């Protein structure tokens, strides 16, 4: 997927079962996936980083498509949640696919330290996200039952980085020629 | 201490300020 | 504004107010970016937030200091000879002027379409001994600009520079520096450019048709020694009062050449810096 | 307009659509007076760390489906904190807001009463003076019914719907605070309910004052792959809990 | 005059003779304010239920005693609620108050150091670079040392301690808030501490903050029948609890 | 100010009044100290004192003329090889960013809990001749924040420092210094930690879990020389503009590794500087 | 001669006063 | 910075001026 674009949908899908679990990240700013993003691609250019964060999401479903996914933030202390309850307890957002269709899940500033590092690093860890089925995904006759959702992140007002550096995600294991 | 344009051109100069 | 700028706090954030609950009709949460906007949505509006007083400056944050840098843009390097000295084309270097010929740097800018600076300066000549004593090595850089005679080799007419510049630097006495005004003949530098030198199905595209600024052509003056030496004098790049216009998606392609954007590697797969998963279901 | 936002803690439920939102007995829940008061203790106050938005187990609407409730006081018996206060406490005093989502599409038909009632002495299945037993009218997030089998030996309550489980016809049960979700303009039901009960503060534990019923009364029906399952999913958010006769702490059953 | 009261929660202590109280670097527990904060969300702050006297598991003062440590963020991480509301959420913050009793008659001979110490790094009893354990600085209310015995496998801290355990002469030891218990005048030793850490509200689980030790200075002599035992009992009070960081729950161990 | 900061007079200590004799009920000797308080007994209490106007200050007991001095913290070494030049991990020094792995000073913070300041910074390189003449040997010094490249080896493309910070020094001109804001996500810089990386058995535990800050990856930018060298380029730390918090008994027992308390001597009995008497009787 | 911050930022400057 | 003839003679000064 990764070499080419899908790699940036997220196909909402069946699911027998119910309650069932869609993906996860992590919020550590600097982690393919996030990392080549817009923001983190910086952020690679700084050694600290802060404030809150803004998660997006859109369905690229149907009109008559119709669906209510759970989403949420797992701050740091424990590991990210294998089911939805356990989730669901921290912080959250219901998101109800409708006429609108860009739910805005925000990630609340959570830490010991007023700053974080953006280097990877065990105690600077900033914690999950994750997103689930509240329902489900009801589609009447003869519209396609599998739809895509694309995922956004953008900054809060809140954020704020320092200590300029160099990255991390670009190695230029050339030269360069002429 | 600062204003002081030893140099007679703008080029030469510090790193700008900020507003 | 010295204190707020000496303790670094002239851009400052906001605060984080407090909120209460929201069982309310009008949804912030939810806006369709498909307006090409973007969300306009904070803490205080998704959660029952607190009352952060903040403190965090966004200076460090500035096209000054995010620009503002020096950088290895240039490593010029002479293995003197002094079996024939002058000769043509020898003991003296020149080398187009730009700045994609080395990326980390050359990455930063391209960061936006338009940039406009003047350009401090710097030269940190290194004298390697081969022999068993240097001497006095002194050196003389200096700038061609268009069209100029650009020596042929060594000792021209062209290092007299009458009207030209003409840098000094002997052993001992410090790194030379220097600063520049902005030279362009267009109000702005032109990092990209989607234009051409003419309709010649043969003609240029790119950076390129427009930076045809310079050129520099070296010199070490001191006339013929015994014991030999290679100079590398190496070119460090900075911006100061700085301008940027029009903001880009960064690079993730390691380049090659300068003044092109061609990726496309030789044999190798493209590659990039995105990372893989297993499963979408476990970070 | 339909669109409605919730804040409750830490939490936040949004919906698109709705049918208004119902506060029992136009009174909003809140903390209780020195003047109706009676206990002596300064009661513990857990704020937005307890009185945020749960939400239980979910569960699959049918088209034999029959019903199924959810006893409030109980059904947060291990919603952290909250849940925890519950046990570590005598008096224990809380109002709630109930978020029922059930969507599917508007091709689609279905209809859903969802009810609150004060005081639900359930009926026991059996004839006799056998009073449904503890552990059955206490199920916890998961609930109660949904058209289950079970032991006839346990004094096991009514599993009878149209009676309400109380034997009054279901229907003079719109005297409850409710509404319903018909999945043609609804897409939730949103009830916010009080404190009512003859006492300031009762037991947590022996005692749950509000008893939650959801009930298909026009059966599900699409023309879809039954590979389309339509949950029901409900959220819940004590609100203004108060607690207090602090102690050691009960035990889980 | 010496008699004390001291009320927390629903509890109460007194002490018909003492030796004043200290408050730990002159500073009274409070709050965190909006200036020095850094957090976003709303902090739960469980009043009484919470900042209330817990008392720990008591101890035995022998004549081969030794000394015993407590580490606080971790001495209640089993007291009802603060205790949950530790494990709840990633961001804990909270002051005490340290009541510890000891007494005997006035026929007795004996004299216990306490002391609270910010920041405790204890050394490993093994020469190297591996640091104590978790699982060991973790003990919980029952504390350590005693003059205990033990696995030199465990990554185990110093059970030495004239060297502080961190190794700095005890006697220096006086530099941090503390106070005796001369069994001639005194009856126990009264610390309350505010929250001292360069970080606004740590990890509750990660970070213990304080750290208290009480060490026999001169040993415990009577002439009495040693069916005459002689306890030392501490109790703890959270004050000012503030917690933030909710989610799902940690895990004991 | 001036006067009294340039006669150092700031801190004056109180003198000491004239007393006369005390029959009376109130014994100031007397206190219990068990209070943990400490005693406020002066000679004026005790004794029959007379007068004496003092003149002592206590400016160079300050927490910043008691920290506010250079130390060697670190002492990088490069014993050059021409004959592998480059190749990986060579001829450039990096070091882990820290106190503790050098006594003397690392004694003096520890003093205190918790501490903050602006750091001055100071590199005394010396080169030692292995050869019968050194040359004209340049040299790089910087600084690899987290996450950043850290040099493989000698020339990778780190050394650009196009966003970085990188310090030139040349033989002849003086040493290179330069200064430094508080580097901490922290209100402070913690001395002590007791605090774990997690519940993994198997975490980190102590000063360090927070203090990630760096590393020093060097450089001899030259190029190949002739005659060998080896160069030890001396690292000197100053604490300007401090703070300290929660004071600490001083150590008494010689560590061994940093970020750690640990005392146990390979072998040898714990030693500490106590003395042994004979007797208690005399002195 | 003082207070001559011949350098813009404050981390650079001389030992701090004592008040 | 200017104006500041650190020489007595005016044969030695800055390049001169434009009007
Ligand atoms: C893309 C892009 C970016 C730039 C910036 C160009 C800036 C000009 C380079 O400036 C120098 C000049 Cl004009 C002369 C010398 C010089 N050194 C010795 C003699 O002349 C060095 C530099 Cl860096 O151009 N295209
Ligand atoms: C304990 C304890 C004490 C400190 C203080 C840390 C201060 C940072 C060290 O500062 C330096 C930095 Cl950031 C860079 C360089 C440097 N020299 C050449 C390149 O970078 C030298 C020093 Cl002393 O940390 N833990």
New binding site residues.
């Given amino acids: 997927n990764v070499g080419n674009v899908s790699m940036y949908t997220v196909q909402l899908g069946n699911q027998t079962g119910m309650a069932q679990k869609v993906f996860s990240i992590k919020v550590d700013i600097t982690s393919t996936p996030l990392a080549t993003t817009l923001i983190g691609e910086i952020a690679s250019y700084y050694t600290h980083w802060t404030g809150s964060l803004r998660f997006s999401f859109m369905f690229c479903g149907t009109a008559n498509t119709t669906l209510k996914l759970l989403l949420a933030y797992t701050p740091p202390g424990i590991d990210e949640p294998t089911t939805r309850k356990d989730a669901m307890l921290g912080t959250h957002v219901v998101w109800d696919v409708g006429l609108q269709s860009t739910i805005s899940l925000v990630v609340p500033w959570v830490s010991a330290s007023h700053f974080r590092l953006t280097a990877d690093n065990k105690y600077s860890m900033a914690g999950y996200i994750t997103c689930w089925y509240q329902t489900n995904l009801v589609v009447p006759p003869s519209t396609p039952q599998t739809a895509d959702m694309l995922c956004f992140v953008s900054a809060c007002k809140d954020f704020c980085l320092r200590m300029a550096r160099d990255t991390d995600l670009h190695i230029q294991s050339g030269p360069i020629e002429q | 201490y600062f204003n002081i344009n030893y140099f007679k051109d703008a080029a030469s100069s510090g790193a700008s300020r900020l507003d | 504004n010295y204190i707020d700028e000496v303790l670094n706090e002239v851009l400052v954030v906001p605060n984080i107010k407090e909120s209460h609950h929201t069982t309310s009709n009008s949804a912030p949460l939810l806006d369709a970016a498909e307006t090409g906007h973007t969300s306009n949505v904070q803490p205080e509006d998704a959660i029952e937030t607190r009352y952060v007083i903040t403190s965090q400056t966004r200076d460090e944050m500035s096209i000054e200091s995010f620009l503002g840098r020096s950088g290895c843009?240039?490593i010029s390097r002479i293995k003197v000879d002094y079996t024939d000295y002058n000769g043509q084309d020898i003991n003296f270097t020149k080398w187009k002027?730009?700045?994609?010929e080395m990326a980390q740097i050359?990455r930063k800018?391209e960061l936006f379409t338009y940039?406009r600076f003047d350009?401090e300066?710097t030269?940190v000549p290194c004298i390697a001994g081969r022999g068993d004593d240097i001497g006095h090595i002194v050196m003389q850089?200096?700038?061609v600009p268009p069209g100029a005679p650009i020596p042929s080799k060594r000792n021209d007419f062209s290092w007299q520079s009458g009207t030209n510049?003409s840098?000094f630097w002997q052993h001992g006495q410090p790194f030379p520096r220097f600063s520049?005004p902005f030279?362009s003949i267009a109000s702005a530098?032109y990092?990209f450019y989607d234009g051409y030198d003419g309709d010649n199905t043969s003609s240029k595209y790119g950076?390129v048709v427009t930076?045809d600024?310079?050129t520099?052509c070296?010199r070490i003056v001191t006339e013929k020694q015994k014991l030999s030496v290679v100079i590398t004098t190496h070119?460090y790049?900075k911006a100061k009062h700085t301008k940027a216009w029009c903001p880009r998606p960064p690079r993730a392609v390691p380049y090659t050449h300068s003044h092109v954007t061609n990726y496309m590697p030789e044999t190798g797969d493209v590659t990039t810096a995105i990372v893989r998963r297993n499963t979408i279901t476990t970070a | 307009d339909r669109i409605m936002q919730i804040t409750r803690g830490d939490s936040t439920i949004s919906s698109d659509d709705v049918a208004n939102a119902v506060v029992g007995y136009g009174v909003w829940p809140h903390y209780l007076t020195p003047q109706d008061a009676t206990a002596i203790n300064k009661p513990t106050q857990p704020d937005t760390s307890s009185n945020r938005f749960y939400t239980l187990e979910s569960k699959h609407w049918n088209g034999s489906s029959k019903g199924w409730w959810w006893k409030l006081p109980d059904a947060l018996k291990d919603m952290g904190i909250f849940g925890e206060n519950m046990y570590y406490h005598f008096l224990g005093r809380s109002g709630y807001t109930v978020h029922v989502q059930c969507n599917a599409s508007k091709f689609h038909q279905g209809t859903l009463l969802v009810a609150m009632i004060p005081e639900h002495q359930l009926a026991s299945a059996k004839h006799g003076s056998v009073t449904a037993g503890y552990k059955l009218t206490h199920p916890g997030e998961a609930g109660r019914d949904v058209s289950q089998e079970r032991d006839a030996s346990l004094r096991q309550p009514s599993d009878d719907s149209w009676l309400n489980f109380d034997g009054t016809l279901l229907g003079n049960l719109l005297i409850f605070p409710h509404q319903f979700i018909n999945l043609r303009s609804n897409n939730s039901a949103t009830l916010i309910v009080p404190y009512v009960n003859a006492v300031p503060m009762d037991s947590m534990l022996r005692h749950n004052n509000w008893c939650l019923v959801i009930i298909p009364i026009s059966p599900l029906r699409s023309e879809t792959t039954s590979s389309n399952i339509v949950p029901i999913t409900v959220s819940i958010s004590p609100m203004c809990a108060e607690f207090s006769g602090a102690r050691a702490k009960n035990i889980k059953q």
């Fill in positions: 843009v240039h002027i730009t700045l994609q050359r800018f940039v350009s300066i030269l850089y200096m700038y510049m840098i520049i030279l530098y990092m950076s930076n600024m310079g520099i070296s070119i790049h």
